[PDB]
């Protein structure tokens, strides 16, 4: 992908907007 999003998705594998992390954007 964009791999801004692969991170993102990766962020979302943790829960994304519920990870406790601000998104990779």
Determine the Cα–Cα distance for residues 5 and 12; give it in Å rounded to an integer. 9
Determine the Cα–Cα distance for residues 2 and 11; give it in Å rounded to an integer. 14
- Residue 6 has which token pair? 């692969």
Q: Residues with Cβ < 8 Å from 10, sequence gap 6 or more?
A: 24
Assign 17 to helix, strand or coil. helix
Give the CA-trace dihedral at 24, 2, 6, 17, to 10 degrees. 40
- The number of CA neighbours under 13 Å toward the Cβ of 6 is 3
- The number of CA neighbours under 13 Å toward the Cβ of 11 is 15
Q: Residues with Cβ < 8 Å from 16, sequence gap 6 or more?
A: 8, 9, 23
User: What experiment produced this structure?
Assistant: NMR
- Residue 25 has which token pair? 């954007």
Give the other-Cβ count within 10 Å of 14's Cβ.
11
């Amino acid at each position: 992908e964009e791999e801004a999003v692969r991170l993102y998705i990766q962020w979302l594998k943790d829960g994304g907007p519920s990870s406790g992390r601000p998104p990779p954007s």
